[PDB]
Protein backbone atom coordinates (compact mmCIF):
# COMPACT_ATOMS: atom_id res chain seq x y z
CA UNK A 1 0.00 0.00 0.00
CA UNK A 2 2.57 2.54 1.24
CA UNK A 3 0.18 5.39 1.97
CA UNK A 4 1.72 8.82 2.63
CA UNK A 5 -0.31 10.88 5.09
CA UNK A 6 0.53 14.57 5.44
CA UNK A 7 -1.25 17.64 6.80
CA UNK A 8 0.05 21.15 6.08
CA UNK A 9 -1.19 24.33 7.76
CA UNK A 10 -0.30 27.86 6.63
CA UNK A 11 -1.61 30.70 8.81
CA UNK A 12 -0.63 34.11 7.41
CA UNK A 13 -0.60 37.60 8.90
CA UNK A 14 -1.99 40.68 7.21
CA UNK A 15 -1.11 44.27 6.46
CA UNK A 16 2.55 44.92 5.71
CA UNK A 17 3.43 41.83 7.77
CA UNK A 18 4.64 38.75 5.89
CA UNK A 19 4.75 36.33 8.81
CA UNK A 20 3.13 32.91 8.92
CA UNK A 21 2.47 29.94 11.18
CA UNK A 22 3.60 26.84 9.28
CA UNK A 23 3.04 23.45 10.91
CA UNK A 24 3.26 20.28 8.83
CA UNK A 25 2.99 16.57 9.58
CA UNK A 26 4.07 13.60 7.48
CA UNK A 27 3.56 9.88 8.03
CA UNK A 28 5.05 7.73 5.26
CA UNK A 29 5.06 3.97 5.83
CA UNK A 30 8.07 3.46 3.54
CA UNK A 31 11.74 2.66 4.16
CA UNK A 32 13.94 5.76 4.11
CA UNK A 33 16.96 5.71 1.81
CA UNK A 34 19.39 6.15 4.69
CA UNK A 35 22.28 3.64 4.68
CA UNK A 36 22.18 3.91 8.49
CA UNK A 37 18.90 3.26 10.32
CA UNK A 38 17.13 4.13 12.50
CA UNK A 39 17.74 7.84 11.83
CA UNK A 40 15.92 9.97 14.41
CA UNK A 41 16.52 13.71 14.14
CA UNK A 42 15.47 16.84 16.01
CA UNK A 43 15.99 20.27 14.44
CA UNK A 44 15.32 23.54 16.28
CA UNK A 45 15.88 26.96 14.73
CA UNK A 46 15.56 30.42 16.25
CA UNK A 47 16.38 33.98 15.19
CA UNK A 48 15.89 37.41 16.75
CA UNK A 49 17.25 40.88 15.90
CA UNK A 50 20.41 41.93 17.71
CA UNK A 51 20.48 45.56 16.55
CA UNK A 52 18.20 46.28 13.56
CA UNK A 53 20.02 49.61 13.21
CA UNK A 54 22.51 47.74 11.01
CA UNK A 55 20.82 44.38 10.48
CA UNK A 56 22.37 41.91 12.94
CA UNK A 57 20.07 39.00 13.76
CA UNK A 58 21.07 36.25 16.18
CA UNK A 59 20.07 33.01 14.43
CA UNK A 60 20.58 29.84 16.46
CA UNK A 61 20.10 26.31 15.14
CA UNK A 62 20.33 23.10 17.18
CA UNK A 63 20.41 19.74 15.39
CA UNK A 64 19.96 16.67 17.59
CA UNK A 65 20.04 13.27 15.93
CA UNK A 66 20.42 9.58 16.76
CA UNK A 67 21.48 7.60 13.67
CA UNK A 68 22.08 3.89 14.36
CA UNK A 69 22.33 4.55 18.11
CA UNK A 70 24.85 7.37 17.55
CA UNK A 71 23.76 10.58 19.28
CA UNK A 72 24.76 13.49 17.04
CA UNK A 73 24.37 17.13 18.05
CA UNK A 74 25.23 20.35 16.21
CA UNK A 75 24.47 23.72 17.81
CA UNK A 76 25.33 26.94 15.98
CA UNK A 77 24.73 30.62 16.72
CA UNK A 78 25.32 33.33 14.13
CA UNK A 79 25.00 37.11 13.90
CA UNK A 80 24.07 37.53 10.23
CA UNK A 81 23.41 40.87 8.55
CA UNK A 82 23.13 42.15 4.99
CA UNK A 83 26.13 44.47 4.72
CA UNK A 84 25.14 45.30 1.14
CA UNK A 85 22.36 44.48 -1.31
CA UNK A 86 24.64 41.74 -2.69
CA UNK A 87 26.97 41.19 0.29
CA UNK A 88 26.19 39.55 3.63
CA UNK A 89 28.33 39.25 6.76
CA UNK A 90 28.05 36.91 9.72
CA UNK A 91 29.89 35.95 12.90
CA UNK A 92 29.19 33.29 15.50
CA UNK A 93 30.19 30.04 17.15
CA UNK A 94 28.94 26.53 17.79
CA UNK A 95 29.81 22.99 18.76
CA UNK A 96 29.63 19.57 17.11
CA UNK A 97 29.23 16.45 19.23
CA UNK A 98 29.09 12.81 18.13
CA UNK A 99 28.99 10.29 20.96
CA UNK A 100 31.82 11.05 23.37
CA UNK A 101 33.65 13.25 20.86
CA UNK A 102 32.78 16.95 20.77
CA UNK A 103 34.66 19.87 19.24
CA UNK A 104 33.53 23.48 19.56
CA UNK A 105 34.02 26.02 16.79
CA UNK A 106 33.84 29.78 16.35
CA UNK A 107 33.77 31.45 12.97
CA UNK A 108 33.44 34.66 10.97
CA UNK A 109 32.28 34.54 7.37
CA UNK A 110 31.04 36.73 4.55
CA UNK A 111 28.96 35.49 1.62
CA UNK A 112 28.78 37.64 -1.51
CA UNK A 113 26.07 36.64 -3.99
CA UNK A 114 26.36 37.78 -7.61
CA UNK A 115 23.89 37.42 -10.47
CA UNK A 116 25.35 36.89 -13.93
CA UNK A 117 23.05 39.55 -15.41
CA UNK A 118 20.73 42.33 -14.27
CA UNK A 119 18.77 42.94 -17.46
CA UNK A 120 15.52 44.83 -16.94
CA UNK A 121 13.94 43.33 -20.07
CA UNK A 122 13.57 40.16 -18.00
CA UNK A 123 12.31 42.17 -15.02
CA UNK A 124 9.62 44.06 -16.96
CA UNK A 125 8.51 41.03 -19.02
CA UNK A 126 8.73 38.09 -16.58
CA UNK A 127 6.27 38.87 -13.76
CA UNK A 128 7.44 35.94 -11.60
CA UNK A 129 11.08 35.16 -12.39
CA UNK A 130 12.16 31.80 -10.96
CA UNK A 131 15.44 30.72 -12.55
CA UNK A 132 18.14 33.28 -11.72
CA UNK A 133 21.67 32.05 -12.39
CA UNK A 134 24.48 33.34 -10.22
CA UNK A 135 27.42 32.60 -7.96
CA UNK A 136 27.89 32.90 -4.20
CA UNK A 137 31.40 33.80 -3.02
CA UNK A 138 31.74 32.42 0.50
CA UNK A 139 34.68 33.83 2.46
CA UNK A 140 34.91 31.78 5.65
CA UNK A 141 37.22 32.37 8.61
CA UNK A 142 36.78 29.68 11.27
CA UNK A 143 38.71 29.04 14.48
CA UNK A 144 38.43 25.70 16.28
CA UNK A 145 40.10 25.05 19.66
CA UNK A 146 42.26 21.92 19.53
CA UNK A 147 41.72 20.22 22.90
CA UNK A 148 41.22 16.52 22.16
CA UNK A 149 44.06 14.48 20.70
CA UNK A 150 41.62 13.84 17.86
CA UNK A 151 41.54 17.58 17.16
CA UNK A 152 45.34 17.52 17.06
CA UNK A 153 45.23 14.56 14.68
CA UNK A 154 42.69 16.18 12.35
CA UNK A 155 44.63 19.46 12.26
CA UNK A 156 48.02 17.83 11.68
CA UNK A 157 46.68 15.51 9.00
CA UNK A 158 44.93 18.39 7.25
CA UNK A 159 47.99 20.66 7.23
CA UNK A 160 50.22 17.80 6.07
CA UNK A 161 47.75 16.96 3.29
CA UNK A 162 47.59 20.60 2.17
CA UNK A 163 51.38 20.82 2.13
CA UNK A 164 51.76 17.50 0.33
CA UNK A 165 49.25 17.40 -2.53
CA UNK A 166 48.41 20.25 -4.90
CA UNK A 167 44.99 18.76 -5.68
CA UNK A 168 43.65 19.32 -2.16
CA UNK A 169 41.58 22.23 -3.51
CA UNK A 170 39.42 20.01 -5.74
CA UNK A 171 39.69 16.68 -3.90
CA UNK A 172 38.25 18.28 -0.75
CA UNK A 173 34.88 18.38 -2.54
CA UNK A 174 34.85 14.58 -2.37
CA UNK A 175 35.25 14.79 1.41
CA UNK A 176 33.20 17.98 1.81
CA UNK A 177 30.02 16.47 0.32
CA UNK A 178 29.74 13.07 1.97
CA UNK A 179 27.80 10.41 0.07
CA UNK A 180 24.93 11.47 -2.18
CA UNK A 181 25.46 15.15 -1.36
CA UNK A 182 27.78 15.30 -4.37
CA UNK A 183 25.05 14.02 -6.69
CA UNK A 184 22.60 16.45 -5.08
CA UNK A 185 24.98 19.28 -5.96
CA UNK A 186 24.79 18.44 -9.65
CA UNK A 187 21.05 17.80 -9.76
CA UNK A 188 20.28 21.09 -8.05
CA UNK A 189 22.38 23.04 -10.53
CA UNK A 190 25.05 23.82 -7.93
CA UNK A 191 28.75 23.69 -8.74
CA UNK A 192 31.45 24.00 -6.09
CA UNK A 193 34.60 25.72 -7.27
CA UNK A 194 37.99 24.60 -6.01
CA UNK A 195 38.36 26.10 -2.54
CA UNK A 196 41.09 28.70 -2.01
CA UNK A 197 42.75 27.90 1.32
CA UNK A 198 44.19 31.28 2.32
CA UNK A 199 46.14 29.89 5.28
CA UNK A 200 45.95 27.27 8.03
CA UNK A 201 47.74 28.52 11.14
CA UNK A 202 47.43 27.56 14.80
CA UNK A 203 48.00 29.84 17.79
CA UNK A 204 47.81 29.28 21.53
CA UNK A 205 44.42 30.74 22.42
CA UNK A 206 42.88 31.15 25.87
CA UNK A 207 43.39 27.58 27.11
CA UNK A 208 45.24 25.88 24.25
CA UNK A 209 46.01 25.87 20.54
CA UNK A 210 43.27 26.99 18.16
CA UNK A 211 43.16 26.01 14.50
CA UNK A 212 42.43 29.19 12.53
CA UNK A 213 41.84 28.44 8.86
CA UNK A 214 41.04 31.03 6.21
CA UNK A 215 39.33 29.54 3.18
CA UNK A 216 36.85 30.56 0.52
CA UNK A 217 34.86 28.98 -2.29
CA UNK A 218 32.50 30.13 -5.03
CA UNK A 219 29.46 27.89 -5.52
CA UNK A 220 27.33 28.73 -8.54
CA UNK A 221 23.81 28.13 -9.72
CA UNK A 222 22.05 27.21 -12.95
CA UNK A 223 18.88 28.90 -11.71
CA UNK A 224 17.33 26.20 -9.53
CA UNK A 225 19.69 26.90 -6.64
CA UNK A 226 17.82 28.52 -3.77
CA UNK A 227 20.79 30.17 -2.07
CA UNK A 228 21.50 32.30 -5.18
CA UNK A 229 18.30 32.88 -7.17
CA UNK A 230 16.45 34.04 -4.03
CA UNK A 231 19.34 35.57 -2.09
CA UNK A 232 17.30 38.55 -0.88
CA UNK A 233 14.27 36.34 -0.10
CA UNK A 234 15.80 33.59 2.06
CA UNK A 235 17.02 36.15 4.63
CA UNK A 236 14.16 38.53 5.52
CA UNK A 237 16.16 40.69 7.92
CA UNK A 238 14.27 43.88 7.03
CA UNK A 239 10.86 42.34 7.80
CA UNK A 240 11.89 40.61 11.03
CA UNK A 241 10.59 42.22 14.22
CA UNK A 242 10.26 39.45 16.84
CA UNK A 243 11.81 36.05 17.62
CA UNK A 244 11.14 33.61 14.79
CA UNK A 245 11.15 29.88 15.47
CA UNK A 246 11.05 26.72 13.36
CA UNK A 247 10.99 23.31 15.07
CA UNK A 248 11.49 20.43 12.63
CA UNK A 249 12.51 16.82 13.23
CA UNK A 250 11.73 13.33 11.99
CA UNK A 251 11.48 9.97 13.72
CA UNK A 252 12.53 7.38 11.15
CA UNK A 253 13.15 3.64 11.23
CA UNK A 254 13.40 0.71 8.84
CA UNK A 255 9.65 0.70 8.13
CA UNK A 256 8.39 4.28 8.28
CA UNK A 257 9.10 8.00 8.18
CA UNK A 258 7.36 10.36 10.61
CA UNK A 259 7.85 14.11 10.12
CA UNK A 260 6.57 17.01 12.24
CA UNK A 261 7.76 20.56 11.51
CA UNK A 262 6.48 23.71 13.22
CA UNK A 263 7.13 27.26 12.15
CA UNK A 264 7.04 30.97 12.94
CA UNK A 265 8.85 33.32 10.57
CA UNK A 266 8.39 36.13 8.01
CA UNK A 267 8.69 35.65 4.27
CA UNK A 268 5.92 33.05 4.03
CA UNK A 269 3.91 35.49 1.90
CA UNK A 270 5.74 37.82 -0.48
CA UNK A 271 4.22 40.62 -2.54
CA UNK A 272 3.66 39.21 -6.02
CA UNK A 273 3.68 42.73 -7.49
CA UNK A 274 1.42 45.76 -7.27
CA UNK A 275 -0.16 45.00 -3.90
CA UNK A 276 -0.94 41.38 -4.78
CA UNK A 277 0.45 39.07 -2.11
CA UNK A 278 1.35 35.45 -2.76
CA UNK A 279 2.76 32.44 -0.99
CA UNK A 280 6.46 32.53 -1.78
CA UNK A 281 7.43 30.50 -4.83
CA UNK A 282 8.32 27.05 -3.58
CA UNK A 283 12.05 26.67 -2.79
CA UNK A 284 13.22 24.39 -5.57
CA UNK A 285 16.35 22.91 -3.97
CA UNK A 286 14.41 21.02 -1.24
CA UNK A 287 12.13 19.57 -3.91
CA UNK A 288 14.91 18.44 -6.24
CA UNK A 289 17.00 17.13 -3.32
CA UNK A 290 14.06 15.11 -2.02
CA UNK A 291 13.88 14.07 -5.69
CA UNK A 292 16.51 11.36 -5.60
CA UNK A 293 14.93 9.97 -2.42
CA UNK A 294 11.18 10.29 -2.96
CA UNK A 295 11.08 8.22 -6.15
CA UNK A 296 12.05 4.88 -4.57
CA UNK A 297 8.49 3.83 -3.70
CA UNK A 298 5.10 4.33 -5.31
CA UNK A 299 2.80 5.84 -2.71
CA UNK A 300 -0.82 6.79 -2.15
CA UNK A 301 -1.03 10.39 -0.94
CA UNK A 302 -3.81 11.99 1.11
CA UNK A 303 -2.31 15.45 1.57
CA UNK A 304 -4.26 18.24 3.27
CA UNK A 305 -3.11 21.84 2.86
CA UNK A 306 -4.95 24.20 5.21
CA UNK A 307 -4.06 27.78 4.28
CA UNK A 308 -5.62 30.26 6.71
CA UNK A 309 -5.62 33.80 5.32
CA UNK A 310 -6.06 36.81 7.60
CA UNK A 311 -9.38 38.61 7.82
CA UNK A 312 -10.52 40.42 4.69
CA UNK A 313 -7.95 38.55 2.57
CA UNK A 314 -9.44 36.87 -0.49
CA UNK A 315 -7.73 34.57 -2.99
CA UNK A 316 -7.28 34.45 -6.75
CA UNK A 317 -5.60 31.99 -9.13
CA UNK A 318 -5.15 28.93 -6.95
CA UNK A 319 -3.64 26.26 -9.21
CA UNK A 320 -4.40 23.54 -8.26
CA UNK A 321 -7.66 25.04 -7.00
CA UNK A 322 -8.54 24.92 -3.32
CA UNK A 323 -10.85 22.00 -2.64
CA UNK A 324 -12.96 23.36 0.23
CA UNK A 325 -13.23 26.72 1.97
CA UNK A 326 -14.43 28.20 5.25
CA UNK A 327 -13.94 31.92 4.57
CA UNK A 328 -10.16 32.03 5.33
CA UNK A 329 -9.48 28.36 6.03
CA UNK A 330 -8.92 27.41 2.40
CA UNK A 331 -8.19 23.71 2.10
CA UNK A 332 -6.40 21.75 -0.62
CA UNK A 333 -7.09 18.02 -0.65
CA UNK A 334 -7.34 15.30 -3.28
CA UNK A 335 -7.98 15.88 -6.95
CA UNK A 336 -5.26 17.94 -8.60
CA UNK A 337 -3.70 18.97 -5.28
CA UNK A 338 -2.84 15.42 -4.18
CA UNK A 339 -1.49 14.87 -7.69
CA UNK A 340 0.75 17.93 -7.31
CA UNK A 341 1.83 16.70 -3.87
CA UNK A 342 2.88 13.36 -5.34
CA UNK A 343 4.63 15.25 -8.14
CA UNK A 344 6.68 17.39 -5.75
CA UNK A 345 7.35 14.54 -3.29
CA UNK A 346 8.85 12.55 -6.16
CA UNK A 347 11.04 15.55 -7.04
CA UNK A 348 8.69 17.64 -9.15
CA UNK A 349 9.13 21.34 -9.77
CA UNK A 350 5.58 22.13 -10.88
CA UNK A 351 4.22 25.49 -9.80
CA UNK A 352 1.45 25.85 -7.21
CA UNK A 353 0.94 29.60 -6.80
CA UNK A 354 -1.53 31.12 -4.32
CA UNK A 355 -2.16 34.76 -5.30
CA UNK A 356 -4.04 36.30 -2.37
CA UNK A 357 -4.93 39.88 -1.48
CA UNK A 358 -7.66 41.73 0.40
CA UNK B 1 -9.51 16.17 23.00
CA UNK B 2 -11.01 13.85 25.61
CA UNK B 3 -12.75 16.42 27.78
CA UNK B 4 -15.37 16.86 25.06
CA UNK B 5 -16.24 13.16 25.06
CA UNK B 6 -16.25 13.44 28.85
CA UNK B 7 -18.77 16.30 28.45
CA UNK B 8 -20.88 15.03 25.55
CA UNK B 9 -21.35 11.94 27.71
CA UNK B 10 -21.22 14.18 30.78
CA UNK B 11 -23.96 16.42 29.42
CA UNK B 12 -26.04 13.42 28.36
CA UNK B 13 -25.74 11.68 31.73
CA UNK B 14 -26.74 14.99 33.33
CA UNK B 15 -29.93 14.86 31.26
CA UNK B 16 -30.37 11.25 32.34
CA UNK B 17 -30.14 12.26 35.99
CA UNK B 18 -32.26 15.38 35.35
CA UNK B 19 -35.19 13.98 33.35
CA UNK B 20 -35.30 11.03 35.75
CA UNK B 21 -35.19 13.38 38.76
CA UNK B 22 -38.04 15.63 37.60
CA UNK B 23 -40.33 12.68 36.85
CA UNK B 24 -40.52 12.08 40.61
CA UNK B 25 -41.58 15.72 41.16
CA UNK B 26 -44.00 16.36 38.27
CA UNK B 27 -46.55 14.04 39.84
CA UNK B 28 -47.96 11.83 37.09
CA UNK B 29 -49.82 8.53 36.88
CA UNK B 30 -47.78 6.20 34.61
CA UNK B 31 -49.06 3.63 32.13
CA UNK B 32 -51.47 0.97 33.49
CA UNK B 33 -48.73 -1.69 33.71
CA UNK B 34 -45.46 0.21 34.05
CA UNK B 35 -42.82 1.23 36.58
CA UNK B 36 -41.96 4.85 37.37
CA UNK B 37 -38.24 4.02 37.49
CA UNK B 38 -37.94 3.12 33.80
CA UNK B 39 -40.76 5.06 32.10
CA UNK B 40 -38.92 8.45 32.18
CA UNK B 41 -35.64 6.75 31.29
CA UNK B 42 -37.13 5.32 28.09
CA UNK B 43 -38.33 8.77 27.00
CA UNK B 44 -34.94 10.27 27.85
CA UNK B 45 -33.18 7.56 25.83
CA UNK B 46 -35.43 8.25 22.85
CA UNK B 47 -34.84 12.00 23.15
CA UNK B 48 -31.07 11.60 23.45
CA UNK B 49 -31.04 9.12 20.56
CA UNK B 50 -32.92 11.66 18.43
CA UNK B 51 -30.41 14.42 19.15
CA UNK B 52 -27.39 12.13 18.85
CA UNK B 53 -28.62 10.63 15.57
CA UNK B 54 -29.22 14.09 14.12
CA UNK B 55 -25.75 15.23 15.22
CA UNK B 56 -23.98 12.15 13.85
CA UNK B 57 -25.89 12.42 10.57
CA UNK B 58 -24.78 16.05 10.27
CA UNK B 59 -21.17 15.21 11.14
CA UNK B 60 -21.06 12.19 8.83
CA UNK B 61 -22.60 13.97 5.85
CA UNK B 62 -20.25 16.89 6.39
CA UNK B 63 -17.23 14.60 6.61
CA UNK B 64 -18.15 12.56 3.52
CA UNK B 65 -18.26 15.82 1.62
CA UNK B 66 -14.69 16.89 2.37
CA UNK B 67 -13.43 13.30 2.11
CA UNK B 68 -15.47 12.42 -0.99
CA UNK B 69 -13.45 12.56 -4.21
CA UNK B 70 -12.98 10.87 -7.57
CA UNK B 71 -11.52 7.89 -5.68
CA UNK B 72 -15.04 7.09 -4.41
CA UNK B 73 -16.07 5.69 -7.81
CA UNK B 74 -16.71 2.36 -6.10
CA UNK B 75 -17.95 1.85 -2.53
CA UNK B 76 -19.93 5.07 -2.79
CA UNK B 77 -22.68 3.29 -4.78
CA UNK B 78 -21.76 -0.01 -3.12
CA UNK B 79 -22.17 1.47 0.36
CA UNK B 80 -25.54 2.91 -0.68
CA UNK B 81 -26.51 -0.48 -2.11
CA UNK B 82 -25.51 -2.39 1.02
CA UNK B 83 -27.45 0.14 3.12
CA UNK B 84 -30.45 -0.52 0.88
CA UNK B 85 -29.92 -4.27 1.30
CA UNK B 86 -29.70 -4.11 5.09
CA UNK B 87 -32.84 -1.95 5.23
CA UNK B 88 -34.75 -4.35 2.97
CA UNK B 89 -33.62 -7.41 4.93
CA UNK B 90 -34.44 -5.73 8.25
CA UNK B 91 -37.89 -5.28 6.73
CA UNK B 92 -38.15 -9.09 6.95
CA UNK B 93 -35.90 -10.28 9.79
CA UNK B 94 -36.46 -7.51 12.35
CA UNK B 95 -39.38 -5.26 11.32
CA UNK B 96 -42.56 -7.15 10.40
CA UNK B 97 -40.84 -10.51 10.64
CA UNK B 98 -43.55 -12.19 8.55
CA UNK B 99 -46.07 -11.32 5.88
CA UNK B 100 -49.37 -10.76 7.67
CA UNK B 101 -51.58 -13.82 8.16
CA UNK B 102 -54.59 -14.54 10.35
CA UNK B 103 -54.25 -15.94 13.86
CA UNK B 104 -54.88 -19.44 12.48
CA UNK B 105 -52.21 -18.88 9.80
CA UNK B 106 -54.37 -18.49 6.68
CA UNK B 107 -53.39 -16.08 3.92
CA UNK B 108 -55.92 -13.63 2.49
CA UNK B 109 -54.62 -11.93 -0.65
CA UNK B 110 -57.69 -11.10 -2.77
CA UNK B 111 -60.89 -9.15 -2.13
CA UNK B 112 -62.49 -12.10 -0.34
CA UNK B 113 -62.96 -10.01 2.81
CA UNK C 1 -10.77 2.27 -4.58
CA UNK C 2 -7.35 1.94 -6.19
CA UNK C 3 -3.90 3.51 -6.23
CA UNK C 4 -3.08 6.86 -7.84
CA UNK C 5 -3.77 5.93 -11.46
CA UNK C 6 -3.04 9.18 -13.35
CA UNK C 7 -3.78 7.82 -16.82
CA UNK C 8 -1.83 9.08 -19.83
CA UNK C 9 -3.26 8.87 -23.35
CA UNK C 10 -1.23 9.11 -26.54
CA UNK C 11 -1.33 7.91 -30.14
CA UNK C 12 1.46 7.78 -32.71
CA UNK C 13 1.23 7.38 -36.48
CA UNK C 14 4.11 6.74 -38.89
CA UNK C 15 3.59 6.53 -42.66
CA UNK C 16 6.68 5.62 -44.67
CA UNK C 17 7.68 5.84 -48.34
CA UNK C 18 9.00 3.12 -50.60
CA UNK C 19 12.14 2.56 -52.60
CA UNK C 20 15.29 4.47 -51.71
CA UNK C 21 13.14 7.21 -50.14
CA UNK C 22 13.51 7.64 -46.38
CA UNK C 23 10.62 10.04 -45.79
CA UNK C 24 7.88 9.53 -43.23
CA UNK C 25 4.68 11.17 -41.99
CA UNK C 26 4.91 11.18 -38.19
CA UNK C 27 1.76 12.17 -36.31
CA UNK C 28 1.56 12.16 -32.53
CA UNK C 29 -0.95 13.37 -29.96
CA UNK C 30 -0.62 12.98 -26.20
CA UNK C 31 -2.53 13.81 -23.04
CA UNK C 32 -1.07 13.33 -19.56
CA UNK C 33 -3.25 14.18 -16.56
CA UNK C 34 -0.26 15.12 -14.40
CA UNK C 35 1.21 18.47 -13.32
CA UNK C 36 4.10 19.49 -15.58
CA UNK C 37 7.46 20.00 -13.88
CA UNK C 38 7.67 23.70 -14.76
CA UNK C 39 8.13 26.38 -12.07
CA UNK C 40 5.94 28.75 -14.12
CA UNK C 41 2.51 27.53 -15.20
CA UNK C 42 0.59 27.42 -17.40
CA UNK C 43 3.01 27.01 -20.31
CA UNK C 44 2.21 26.86 -24.02
CA UNK C 45 4.39 26.49 -27.10
CA UNK C 46 3.92 26.37 -30.87
CA UNK C 47 6.98 24.90 -32.59
CA UNK C 48 7.25 25.25 -36.37
CA UNK C 49 10.06 23.62 -38.36
Amino acid sequence: VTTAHSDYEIVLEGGSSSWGKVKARAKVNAPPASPLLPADCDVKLNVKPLDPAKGFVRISAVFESIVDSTKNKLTIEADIANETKERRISVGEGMVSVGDFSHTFSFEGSVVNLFYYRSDAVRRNVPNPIYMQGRQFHDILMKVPLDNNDLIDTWEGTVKAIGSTGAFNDWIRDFWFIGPAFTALNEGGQRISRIEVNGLNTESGPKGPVGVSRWRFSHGGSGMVDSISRWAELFPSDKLNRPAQVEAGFRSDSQGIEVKVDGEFPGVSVDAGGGLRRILNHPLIPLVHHGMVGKFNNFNVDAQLKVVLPKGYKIRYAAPQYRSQNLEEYRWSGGAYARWVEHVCKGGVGQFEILYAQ
Amino acid sequence: NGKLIALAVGGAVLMGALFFSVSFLTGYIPAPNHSAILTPLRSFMGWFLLIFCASIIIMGLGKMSSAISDKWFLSFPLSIFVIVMVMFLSLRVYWEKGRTTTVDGKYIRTTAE
Amino acid sequence: GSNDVTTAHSDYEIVLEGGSSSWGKVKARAKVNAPPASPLLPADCDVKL
Binding site: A318, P320, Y322, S324, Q325, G335 | S66, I68 | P42, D44
Partner: peptide, 15 residues
Protein backbone atom coordinates in the same frame (compact mmCIF):
# COMPACT_ATOMS: atom_id res chain seq x y z
CA UNK D 1 -4.74 34.19 -23.40
CA UNK D 2 -5.49 30.55 -22.63
CA UNK D 3 -4.17 31.13 -19.10
CA UNK D 4 -6.71 33.92 -18.50
CA UNK D 5 -9.62 31.52 -19.01
CA UNK D 6 -8.15 29.18 -16.40
CA UNK D 7 -7.33 32.18 -14.20
CA UNK D 8 -10.92 33.46 -14.35
CA UNK D 9 -12.67 30.21 -13.38
CA UNK D 10 -14.83 29.53 -10.35
CA UNK D 11 -13.64 26.74 -8.07
CA UNK D 12 -14.79 23.55 -9.83
CA UNK D 13 -13.47 21.12 -7.20
CA UNK D 14 -16.65 21.04 -5.12
CA UNK D 15 -17.80 17.74 -3.68
Amino acid sequence: RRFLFQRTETRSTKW
